[PDB]
Amino acid sequence: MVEDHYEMGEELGSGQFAIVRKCRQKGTGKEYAAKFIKKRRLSSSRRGVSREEIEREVNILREIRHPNIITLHDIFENKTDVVLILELVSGGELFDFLAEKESLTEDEATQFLKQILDGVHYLHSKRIAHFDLKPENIMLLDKNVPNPRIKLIDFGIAHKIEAGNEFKNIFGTPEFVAPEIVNYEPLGLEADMWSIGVITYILLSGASPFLGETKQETLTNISAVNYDFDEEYFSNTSELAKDFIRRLLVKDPKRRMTIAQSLEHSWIKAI
Amino acid sequence: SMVEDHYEMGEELGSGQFAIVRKCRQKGTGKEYAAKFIKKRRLSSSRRGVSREEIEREVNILREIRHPNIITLHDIFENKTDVVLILELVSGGELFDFLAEKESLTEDEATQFLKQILDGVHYLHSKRIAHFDLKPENIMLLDKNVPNPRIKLIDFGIAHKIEKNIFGTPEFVAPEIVNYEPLGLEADMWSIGVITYILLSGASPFLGETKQETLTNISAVNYDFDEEYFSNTSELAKDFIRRLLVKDPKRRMTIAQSLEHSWIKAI
Numbered sequence: 001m002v003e004d005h006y007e008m009g010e011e012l013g014s015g016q017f018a019i020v021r022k023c024r025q026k027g028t029g030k031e032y033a034a035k036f037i038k039k040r041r042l043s044s045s046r047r048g049v050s051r052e053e054i055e056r057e058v059n060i061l062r063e064i065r066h067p068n069i070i071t072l073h074d075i076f077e078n079k080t081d082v083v084l085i086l087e088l089v090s091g092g093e094l095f096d097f098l099a100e101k102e103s104l105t106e107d108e109a110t111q112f113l114k115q116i117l118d119g120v121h122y123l124h125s126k127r128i129a130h131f132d133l134k135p136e137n138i139m140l141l142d143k144n145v146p147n148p149r150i151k152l153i154d155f156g157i158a159h160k161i162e163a164g165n166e167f168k169n170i171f172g173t174p175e176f177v178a179p180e181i182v183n184y185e186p187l188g189l190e191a192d193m194w195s196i197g198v199i200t201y202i203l204l205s206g207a208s209p210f211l212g213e214t215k216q217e218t219l220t221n222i223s224a225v226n227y228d229f230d231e232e233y234f235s236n237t238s239e240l241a242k243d244f245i246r247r248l249l250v251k252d253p254k255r256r257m258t259i260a261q262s263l264e265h266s267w268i269k270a271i
Numbered sequence: 272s273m274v275e276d277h278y279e280m281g282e283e284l285g286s287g288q289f290a291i292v293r294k295c296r297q298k299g300t301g302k303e304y305a306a307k308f309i310k311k312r313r314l315s316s317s318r319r320g321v322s323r324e325e326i327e328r329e330v331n332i333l334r335e336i337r338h339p340n341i342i343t344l345h346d347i348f349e350n351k352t353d354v355v356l357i358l359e360l361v362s363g364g365e366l367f368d369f370l371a372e373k374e375s376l377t378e379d380e381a382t383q384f385l386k387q388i389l390d391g392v393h394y395l396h397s398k399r400i401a402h403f404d405l406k407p408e409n410i411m412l413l414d415k416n417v418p419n420p421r422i423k424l425i426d427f428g429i430a431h432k433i434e435k436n437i438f439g440t441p442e443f444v445a446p447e448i449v450n451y452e453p454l455g456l457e458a459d460m461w462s463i464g465v466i467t468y469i470l471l472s473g474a475s476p477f478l479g480e481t482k483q484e485t486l487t488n489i490s491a492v493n494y495d496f497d498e499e500y501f502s503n504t505s506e507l508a509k510d511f512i513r514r515l516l517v518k519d520p521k522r523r524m525t526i527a528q529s530l531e532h533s534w535i536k537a538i
C-alpha cells in the first residue's frame with residue numbers, strides 16, 4: 001500500500017487516465033510525484049490503460065538513469081491503479097520560463113537545445129523512441145537556479161525499437177503473410193529527430209512551422225513538409241541554425257539526421 | 272497458489288519462444304490440459320526470456336476468448352521464474368495432416384472445414400483481435416477420432432487488439448506518424464485466401480525460390496491458378512480466393528463477407 005509508505009499531497013496535474021499528486025516518502029522525507037494510472041478492467045473497455053501498456057511504460061522508465069530524463073523511484077499497485085513514484089520536477093515548462101524574458105539570443109537558446117539533444121542521445125542509445133517530444137514534455141527541474149536543467153517527461157507512448165529482423169522471424173516464413181506485412185515500415189527513432197527539428201524552429205523563432213487553422217490543416221502541412229524560413233521570423237537566425245533544422249525536417253525518415261549527426265553538426269559543436 | 276498443488280505434471284508436448292509445454296491433469300477433476308511454462312525475462316537480462324509486456328498482451332487476449340473453434344485458457348499461475356498457462360489440450364494434430372490422410376476429399380468437405388476456420392475468425396474479429404499468424408500449422412483438430420472433427424485455432428503469440436490517435440497538439444508529429452497505416456484484421460483475411468488456395472490444390476500461391484522472390488510475389492499479388500493443379504476446382508471456389516488475395520486491404524472481403532459468399536453459404 002502506497003499510503004503506508006508515502007504521504008500524499010496536492011494534485012499537480014492530469015493526463016491520459018492518470019492523475020499526478022505530490023508526495024513525500026515516509027522515513028526519508030524525500031519528495032516525489034506519484035502518478036496514479038487507472039487500470040483498464042475488461043479488455044473490451046476503452047477506459048483506463050491496459051496492463052500491457054502500463055508495463056511497456058514502466059519497463060522503459062526502469063532503465064532510465066540520465067540527468068535530463070525523469071526517473072522512476074518506486075512502484076505500487078492497488079485495486080484500481082498502478083502508482084508510479086517519479087522524480088519530482090518543479091520548474092515548469094521550458095517555454096514558460098523563456099516567457100519571463102524580454103528576448104532570447106540564439107546562443108542562450110542553444111544552451112537548452114544541447115540538453116534536449118543529450119537526453120535524446122541517451123534514449124536513442126537504448127533504442128527508446130519517445131514519440132511525443134513537444135514543448136509541454138520539456139520541463140525544468142528548478143527554474144530559479146543560474147543554469148536550469150532540462151527534464152524530459154511523459155513516456156506514455158514511448159517504445160523500444162527492435163532490430164528489423166526481430167519482426168520478420170516471428171512468422172516462421174513469409175508464405176502466409178499479407179502485402180501490408182511484407183511492406184511494413186515501422187516507426188522509429190527518426191520520428192523524434194523530426195520533432196526536435198520542430199522544437200528548434202519554434203525555440204528560435206516563436207513560430208510554429210506547420211500549424212494550420214484546424215488540426216487537419218496542420219497535418220496536411222506536416223505531410224507536405226510545407227514550411228519556410230520567412231525573414232519576419234528568421235532575420236536574426238544564423239544560416240547554420242537553419243541548416244540544422246532543414247536536415248531534420250525531411251519527409252523521408254531515412255534521410256533525416258540521426259541524433260549522433262545532430263550532435264556532430266557544426267551549429268551544435270560550436271556550443 | 273502454485274501450479275503443482277493443483278495439477279499433476281506429465282510428459283513434454285512441445286516448445287515455443289522460451290517456453291516448454293507439458294501435459295497435465297487437474298487434481299479434483301482428473302481432466303487433462305496442456306501447461307505452457309513461459310520463462311520470464313529478468314530485469315538484468317537483454318534477450319533471455321519473454322518480456323512481461325508480451326506475456327500480458329497474449330494473456331489478455333486468451334482471457335477474453337471463448338469459442339468452440341479457438342483454444343481455451345483454463346488457468347494461469349506464476350512462480351519465481353515462469354508464467355504458466357493451463358490451456359485446453361488439443362490432441363488431434365494439424366488439419367492439413369488429417370485431410371492428407373483421406374482417401375478422397377471433395378470440395379464440399381473442404382468447405383465445411385474452412386467454414387469452421389471462418390467461424391473462429393469471425394469471433395476473433397468481433398473482439399477486434401487480429402491473429403496475424405494464421406497458417407496450417409496453427410489450425411489444429413481437437414480430436415481426430417470423431418466423425419466430424421472440430422477445428423481449433425492456436426498460437427496467439429503475435430495476436431493483437433486492433434484500435435487521429437493524437438489527443439494533444441499535432442504540431443510536432445512526424446509525417447510517418449501522420450500517415451501511419453496500422454496493420455489490421457484484413458491481414459487475417461489474406462491469410463485465409465492463401466490457406467484456401469493450398470487446401471484445394473496443394474500448391475502455394477506466392478512461394479518463390481528464395482525469400483526475396485516470395486516477398487516480391489506477395490507484394491505484387493503475382494499468382495495464378497495452374498490448369499493442372501486447379502483442374503478439379505470450381506470457379507466459385509476460385510472466386511472466393513480471388514476476393515481475398517487483393518493488395519489493398521480495404522478491398523478484401525471481410526470475415527462477414529466471406530461467410531456470405533456463395534461458396535460458403537450455398538452449402
Ligand SMILES: NS(=O)(=O)c1cccc(-c2nnn[nH]2)c1
Binds near residue numbers: 012013016035155
Ligand atoms: N503533472 S503533469 O500534468 O505535467 C503530468 C501529467 C501526466 C503525466 C506526467 C508525467 N508522466 N511521466 N512523467 N511525468 C505529468
